Design a protein around this ligand. Structure first.
Ligand SMILES: CC(C)(COP(=O)(O)OP(=O)(O)OC[C@H]1O[C@@H](n2cnc3c(N)ncnc32)[C@H](O)[C@@H]1OP(=O)(O)O)[C@@H](O)C(=O)NCCC(=O)NCCSC(=O)CCC[N+](=O)[O-]
Ligand SMILES: CC(C)(COP(=O)(O)OP(=O)(O)OC[C@H]1O[C@@H](n2cnc3c(N)ncnc32)[C@H](O)[C@@H]1OP(=O)(O)O)[C@@H](O)C(=O)NCCC(=O)NCCSC(=O)CCC[N+](=O)[O-]
Ligand SMILES: CC(C)(COP(=O)(O)OP(=O)(O)OC[C@H]1O[C@@H](n2cnc3c(N)ncnc32)[C@H](O)[C@@H]1OP(=O)(O)O)[C@@H](O)C(=O)NCCC(=O)NCCSC(=O)CCC[N+](=O)[O-]
Ligand SMILES: CC(C)(COP(=O)(O)OP(=O)(O)OC[C@H]1O[C@@H](n2cnc3c(N)ncnc32)[C@H](O)[C@@H]1OP(=O)(O)O)[C@@H](O)C(=O)NCCC(=O)NCCSC(=O)CCC[N+](=O)[O-]
Ligand SMILES: Cc1cc2nc3c(=O)[nH]c(=O)nc-3n(C[C@H](O)[C@H](O)[C@H](O)COP(=O)(O)OP(=O)(O)OC[C@H]3O[C@@H](n4cnc5c(N)ncnc54)[C@H](O)[C@@H]3O)c2cc1C
Ligand SMILES: Cc1cc2nc3c(=O)[nH]c(=O)nc-3n(C[C@H](O)[C@H](O)[C@H](O)COP(=O)(O)OP(=O)(O)OC[C@H]3O[C@@H](n4cnc5c(N)ncnc54)[C@H](O)[C@@H]3O)c2cc1C
Ligand SMILES: Cc1cc2nc3c(=O)[nH]c(=O)nc-3n(C[C@H](O)[C@H](O)[C@H](O)COP(=O)(O)OP(=O)(O)OC[C@H]3O[C@@H](n4cnc5c(N)ncnc54)[C@H](O)[C@@H]3O)c2cc1C
Ligand SMILES: Cc1cc2nc3c(=O)[nH]c(=O)nc-3n(C[C@H](O)[C@H](O)[C@H](O)COP(=O)(O)OP(=O)(O)OC[C@H]3O[C@@H](n4cnc5c(N)ncnc54)[C@H](O)[C@@H]3O)c2cc1C
Lengths: 390, 390, 390, 390
């Protein structure tokens, strides 16, 4: 009565809606996404259509209530990210930015006018957006950003100068959610659109992780922003971090799908591949590995479920997310890597996919807070003493 | 709004009864058990009273319905083991044998006569019992036991010959649940009592783990057992394993209490102890450690909860228990060990307790299935191929 | 008086010749190889010239005495592989095959005629060769190969049928050292040349490790081999394994150069990059990592030296090589991976190289005996009991 | 031709003297020490005779030239510590204090008068001494000690006040090498003798590591020290650290003997013990473990040799010692722990010794610089930036 595909019976913890949503999406991901990943990753191609397609299904910004959004549960959102990442982290990355980094901030910190004007377009996937926070000299430390936004009392607008790097979707984005430090000292959010004079977003080259994802910079040379494009609700790092926490939540779920794909591929390979007469799955060394993968995946899955439920209850704290994001991203990496080692020579061929996952999880464990930064965060909470600086 | 003592809010997942039971027991453990552990461990003393005391509280065999038993939930049983182990694994070990290895088998595989005759005595703690399975040459492999039970068609009884070693409570036990191989090939359970001619149970010496626990052998020299003392419900290893699974379930919870005590002690020490001017808790190396402990403890806690709920639903499978028992016992060990290292020189003094926990968890990770054996078990389930033998 | 670039003063353990050779080669590798690796790896381009160039320097098959070979020490050979791998594993791979897998077997198991005919050409780099052992269904287990060589009593020749896969250099090789099972049961070595009817060697596609290296198959459709092309000295797996051991020896050294490059890059990045005001190198978490890298590299370096000396003394045993190859390849991987994590977002850009090393070491830890296979080898030696099969 | 007891042939790297010394000592350790360890550890008994016995053999302070000392090599000193620790760390601890913490400082920083007066007595083992540096509030940070030594211009002497804790041998010592901070700010060394009014050294209780070793405090209540008892050569922490480095060197070797004993015991147990029909040594999981132990031991052994040679050449730097001490002590621990797990239930019985080693290595990895402190030391050297404080 034991099912290795669901050791602790996650299923009976999901509502019928949640289960329906997952199954529906999984179908799309396997029929439409999986078949285009081999070459999209191999040649760094990002199909812009993927956003329109997901736009149709109504998967973009699923937790938002209204404005053409499904208004589903945090758990469902997690289940979605898991099915997406089960195909490729690059894809899930685009869906994470669109949902938790663009739509969410506009929704939570924007004016109704902005909401009405953008939320529907984003939800349908007619507007590919991006989140501009990181800068060449500001990553783990955002209070060090150099992008300044000056106010023009006369024209009722701000002039932005700065450079954002390592930005997902920037190269082919229509809307840019940028954060700059103001003359008053506060850091606000600005909405920029392709075409604004002074705005350019070149592609980054030489990526060997999340290749099926578009990544570039956001260069602002005296870009002038109207006042109605200023996110009226965020006055400090609390705004971007609020968004970051919703993204990290989805990433915690996501990577588990990636891990699951590795476990399944490794397991099958162990059964089909044979050496020394019997199938690889007959050796003790191979089996212990499969055991460790399943073990870690399971602990992560049920922990994620809990957080999702606590979230919908407005009981989830930032630390809680740091805890699962840090854990799951790290563990996922080891699983991918063990999987790679288990396929032997074949393991280094994208034809077998594991290598693609191992490489993607490399970037995943880095962005949205590095593995160690999330530890200092937990540590500050545990001791009440900060240890980021000296 | 983040509480490091309950990251994912386990509390709101417990029923009022469960919470009451835990709090009630915790009080007993902290007022009556903690104050007698330093010297009991230091001098290998086991207070037989502890069983009578626990007998009063009605903690012995708590999941049993009737016969003077509380008839509580699997979760409550887990919460109890956790509070006990939070003091010492030796104590929890006695309570695990009494509840899941003696009372449970009598209850599940015994005759009403046996139930009526023993269950109440055991529940009140008037009878200290033990489980005799392991033998000098049979541990991970029980189908290799040498204890034979011959049938006496005439006297309607069996004569038992064999030796059981590493048995918890045997030295001061009144009832012995022994398993021997029969002439028909099946392995049944026999109930023995102190005083039976031919039965001796000497203490084992030189233990440096679970010292506050009594451990010895069960030597049977032609011990004659009446027919009414044969567990009529167990005809093969399914009987002992059935019991083993209920014990392992409690152990999965248990070790988490032990880990929690280590985390708390380490955390405090980090705050109170100071070097280089500031408190140890200010250093990055110290904080990351605290983070890792809390992380692992949390994943284990919520996984255990789930299993407990699935168990009460008669939906828990042996593999599920192997998964959490293996995980939690291993992780608990690392936590104890990190804790020890964090207290520095003081860490090797029982006066600071961590060293006692590190040593206890050593035996815990070994009995009731070694860390690796539980992996081969998971592996057999995952691949459908056995890898214990060649 | 402590030098982190040589903790235990390896230098004073090298003879003047050895040191000269290393320095000479290092110059070539840094001036000629490093500048062509970024794009060669990025676009899977292998410069055939690299072999001719190395041919000039006389680095090809350096331990061979005569036939236009330098006839240097095993240590010098190790020092060479280390400088090469310090640039890229792909390059070192080509030099390992040429030297220990092609030239060595011809030298040790060939006829003078063969030696005279090939050794000089190979040494000058006029003949790019390859070693064909692995097959689609035979990797860790070579006694399972399906490539058969039938004897033609009449024409005094053998007809070979089979497929070798994952072969380094095969796509642009001139000489092929192939091993097939014979009708007598023994497995011998055959020398094949491009152009032989029935012989094809297509490129393998989709590699995400050792990309600057050419890899393909060796397909033999009734390829007819003259008798004078049969390696007269190898009659069983002892031949290929003899060669394998010389290759593995160089790989043990090699990966250390790769690790060293990662340590240096990480260290510098830690000093130049700044967050939270100070340089990354100021944080405890960063420093411990640097410590662990240096520690492992050092142990490996001095162990390799010893083996090299024992080798030149004809005192080196296969197990000794398994021990260092397994160790160094595994440790190297962790170092590369930590390095990658330390550069943050930048770490996933080939522009920073670490990602290239992390990916290369993935294949390195797999070929020439997987990490676990080398463990079973050590284990057989330690216990005297084989554990490869059931 | 492969010998698992000496994978890389350490033997042929030792001079005839060194080998003779090792073999001679090993005989003493196995015939005189091993037979008294079971109960000495079990009952915390320290045989003072052990020092006299070692005094006879001339093993005390073996590197010292003159004053009744063997004047042997650093390597020989290492070989000695290894044979001693192969029996028990407690014993090696007494020999480390006597040699590198008492005799060495007197020799290097003392006056001829002091040398003449003590060195011979210590060498013969007529004077059991101890090193008093650590204090209740000063461990990893010695520049925080509170033991002050006031000068009495009149009586030409100093009055010492302070408390040293966790001191090896203090309870039954005759000579005390104590370090206190002076009114001039410098920290010097003082020689104290049992009987000095105001001096007491009570035993520490509740140790569960290094039990066969005597450990206590050094309480100084206005103890008056003559001027001729002041170590005239040490004026700051450079004195104690100089000594510390010689002790740490021996500890690096030492723990390897402890590891070796564990490997041998585990290996044998794997061959003799049988489950599931065959010997434990037949399982893949068991073999990989044995492989990892041997691997780590070997790397450590040859690294230690090198350092020893560099030391005798006056080319060894503090960092070099931190590197091997940190490495070997940590690795040794894992080996002991794996060994313990491999003996199963038996593993927790001192009757099988491994448990004793696992527990001893716990304290060893802590004193003479914790595992992490040695990392910050290496890190300071690698980056040139200190990270101990904020
Ligand atoms: C801020 C830190 C750097 C540390 O410096 P500190 O000085 O200690 O700042 P503090 O954190 O102490 O204070 C700053 C204010 O921020 C608030 N805060 C902190 N954490 C959170 C969370 N999780 N959610 C909401 N708000 C939060 C805090 O309460 C303060 O608020 P107010 O009172 O409202 O003013 C760190 O805590 C942190 O969170 N950042 C680390 C790096 C990071 O956040 N990088 C983001 C990367 S974006 C990305 O990767 C896009 C990828 C998407 N994709 O999937 O492709
Ligand atoms: C049996 C094994 C050794 C492996 O050999 P295998 O040949 O593969 O046996 P199989 O397992 O294939 O078959 C034997 C039968 O047993 C059944 N089985 C297996 N696992 C379970 C669980 N968890 N629960 C109930 N029944 C179980 C199985 O279905 C078969 O049943 P029937 O059809 O009914 O006849 C292994 O699976 C195992 O479970 N044992 C490992 C060692 C062990 O169990 N030791 C127990 C120690 S007791 C102890 O530590 C007391 C400490 C208490 N304390 O807290 O102090
Ligand atoms: C043979 C094994 C698979 C295990 O099966 P077993 O049944 O136990 O075989 P056995 O090993 O017991 O017996 C076979 C005979 O082989 C001999 N042997 C074993 N090891 C060695 C070494 N190291 N050197 C020389 N000879 C050796 C052995 O003494 C026997 O000899 P004779 O008496 O002379 O007849 C294993 O031991 C092994 O060595 N192979 C594992 C996989 C492997 O070797 N793959 C090679 C890959 S090639 C490659 O990766 C090219 C990459 C180059 N590059 O850098 O790009
Ligand atoms: C000093 C530290 C705490 C860090 O603080 P810092 O502010 O950075 O001090 P600094 O280290 O920067 O400066 C202090 C001076 O000390 C010198 N130093 C440092 N390391 C060494 C070594 N290895 N050998 C000789 N001299 C050394 C340094 O060059 C300075 O010298 P001068 O110019 O001559 O004046 C740390 O570096 C350290 O070494 N100590 C860590 C803890 C420790 O040393 N504990 C000792 C325990 S004793 C024991 O365990 C007995 C057990 C025996 N047994 O086997 O049973
Ligand atoms: C594929 C990809 C897509 C990305 N997409 C986006 C996007 O859409 N939007 C956006 O805003 N950003 C994005 N980023 C960047 C990401 O958010 C930043 O990488 C991350 O916040 C910070 O790291 P960093 O690159 O600046 O490196 P750093 O912050 O410089 O860190 C480098 C290393 O140093 C460590 N470190 C830093 N500070 C400390 C400390 N105090 N103590 C101990 N260790 C420390 C880190 O843990 C890490 O190991 C992306 C990155 C990748 C790789
Ligand atoms: C304090 C304490 C109390 C105990 N109390 C009881 C009690 O009350 N009742 C009872 O019946 N028993 C009891 N036991 C014993 C316990 O159940 C047995 O230790 C356990 O089932 C088996 O291990 P073993 O000691 O026989 O060692 P082994 O089974 O011999 O195993 C030794 C080592 O070998 C490994 N191993 C074994 N087989 C394999 C394989 N096929 N593949 C790979 N590795 C393998 C193990 O994982 C372990 O690392 C107790 C033990 C301790 C230490
Ligand atoms: C870039 C690259 C270049 C290569 N170049 C060459 C070349 O020039 N010449 C040549 O002959 N070959 C070459 N190879 C192939 C290499 O030698 C084979 O990959 C290796 O010997 C065996 O692995 P495999 O791919 O067959 O996988 P497998 O042997 O099938 O192994 C797969 C996984 O199963 C494990 N496994 C296998 N058997 C056991 C067991 N009994 N117990 C426990 N675990 C087991 C392995 O450890 C591994 O994790 C190359 C491979 C790569 C990736
Ligand atoms: C059996 C035994 C015998 C001993 N014998 C002697 C003897 O003969 N003579 C003598 O002088 N001393 C002796 N000592 C004590 C030993 O030298 C001290 O334990 C050691 O120098 C320091 O640790 P501590 O106990 O003070 O703990 P702490 O220094 O307080 O450290 C506690 C924990 O905090 C960590 N820590 C401390 N500072 C930092 C930091 N800045 N950053 C990150 N982590 C940090 C440590 O690594 C450790 O994990 C003995 C100890 C034992 C256990």
């Amino acid at each position: 009565e034991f099912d290795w595909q669901d050791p602790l019976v996650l299923e009976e913890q999901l509502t019928t809606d949640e289960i329906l949503i997952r199954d529906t999406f999984r179908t799309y991901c396997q029929e439409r996404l999986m078949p285009r990943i081999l070459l999209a990753n191999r040649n760094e191609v990002f199909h812009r259509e993927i956003i329109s397609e997901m736009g149709e299904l109504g998967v973009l910004g699923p937790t938002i209530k209204g404005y053409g959004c499904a208004g589903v549960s945090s758990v469902a959102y997690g289940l979605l990210a898991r099915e997406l990442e089960r195909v490729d982290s690059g894809y899930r990355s685009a869906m994470s930015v669109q949902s938790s980094l663009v739509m969410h901030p506009i929704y939570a910190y924007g004016s109704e006018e902005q909401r009405q004007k953008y939320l529907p377009q984003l939800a349908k996937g007619e507007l590919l957006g991006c989140f501009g926070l990181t800068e060449p000299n500001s990553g783990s430390d955002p209070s060090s950003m150099e992008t300044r936004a000056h106010y023009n009392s006369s024209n009722k607008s701000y002039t932005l100068n700065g450079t954002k790097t390592w930005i997902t979707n920037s190269p082919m984005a229509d809307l840019f959610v940028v954060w700059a430090r103001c003359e008053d000292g506060c850091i606000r959010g600005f909405l920029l659109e392709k075409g604004m004079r002074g705005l350019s977003a070149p592609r980054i080259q030489g990526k060997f992780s999340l290749r099926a994802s578009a990544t570039g910079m956001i260069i602002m040379d005296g870009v002038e922003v109207p006042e109605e494009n200023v996110l009226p609700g965020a006055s400090s790092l609390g705004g971007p971090f609020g968004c970051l926490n919703n993204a990290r939540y989805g990433i915690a779920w996501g990577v588990l799908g990636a891990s699951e794909f590795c476990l399944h591929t490794a397991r099958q390979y162990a059964l089909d591949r044979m050496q020394f007469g019997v199938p690889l799955a007959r050796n003790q060394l191979i089996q212990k590995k499969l055991a460790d993968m399943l073990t870690e995946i399971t602990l992560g899955l049920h922990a994620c479920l809990q957080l999702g439920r606590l979230k919908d209850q407005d009981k989830a704290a930032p630390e809680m997310v740091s805890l699962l994001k840090r854990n799951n991203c790290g563990k996922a990496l080891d699983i991918a890597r063990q999987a790679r080692d288990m396929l032997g020579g074949n393991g280094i061929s994208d034809e077998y996919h594991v290598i693609r996952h191992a490489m993607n999880l490399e970037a995943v464990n880095t962005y949205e807070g590095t593995h160690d930064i999330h530890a200092l965060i937990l540590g500050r909470a545990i001791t009440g003493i900060q240890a980021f600086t000296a």
